[PDB]
């Protein structure tokens, strides 16, 4: 509802960029002096399709209406979405340049499990659960950062029917979204599973979601490699073992990636799993 007006907002560099979204940062400095208040602000690339625009709405509403300590602050529009800066960015770029503890890695999962929890209340899957959507604001702070797949469920059924997209995230998807094409709240979890597998491995490139499954698929598989990623996966293959990550932690993992959705733990299940975790590996 607040209107930032577009004379004030002073570029100062491109934060990130998706297939059809650009992040940047701005100074919203009506004046010129030094209050100059830092945003992050969302725009539609070129490219963008009518489908894509015509979801772009939906997802500023979204972001909204959500109000959570562990979701990016929505600030308002001038369209384009105006957020709050999030000082530390993305755990993806963070995790390979600082070594952080496993006491603070459980830390972060388990507040990407309250934003998700609240998400999940107010009846919005994710679809792009990863630690690229997931804002660093300190040490001890974590927040979900983007919403750019973010869907309302239907009120009468228990997933959303996904409309077989090639920006789609399939690495960190769970068989019956890459099979059935339907995304259950059971589905984020998959992606945490996912998400915490990247935590783990410090978010490095070599030991990354794509790499991994692409070593197990093969990079000459024609128009198959979503179909031979549903087999692995249905077969029971999983991600490997992060060095150094605790046995109850991996399974853990394991128990987010169960094939059946309803053997999944709930995200309301995760908070009090993961805070005793922390707790001791805080310790
Ligand atoms: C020191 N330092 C701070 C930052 C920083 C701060 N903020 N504050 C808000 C957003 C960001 C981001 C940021 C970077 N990538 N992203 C995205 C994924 C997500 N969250 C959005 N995606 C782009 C599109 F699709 F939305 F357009 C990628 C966001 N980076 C980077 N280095």
Redesign the pocket.
Known sequence: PTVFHKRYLKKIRD????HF???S?YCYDPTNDGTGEMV?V?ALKADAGPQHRSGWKQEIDILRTLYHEHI?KYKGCCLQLV????????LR?YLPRHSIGLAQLLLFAQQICEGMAYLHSQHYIHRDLAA??V?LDNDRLVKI??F?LAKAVPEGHEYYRVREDGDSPVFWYAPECLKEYKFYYASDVWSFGVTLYELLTHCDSSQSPPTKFLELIGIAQGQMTVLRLTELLERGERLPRPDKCPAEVYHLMKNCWETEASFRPTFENLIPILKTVHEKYQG
Request: glycine share 24%; no cysteine; charged share 25%.
């Open positions: 934060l990130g960029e998706g979204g650009k992040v940062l992050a969302k990016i957020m709050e800066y999030v000082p530390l960015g993305s770029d690229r959507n804002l950062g983007d750019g």
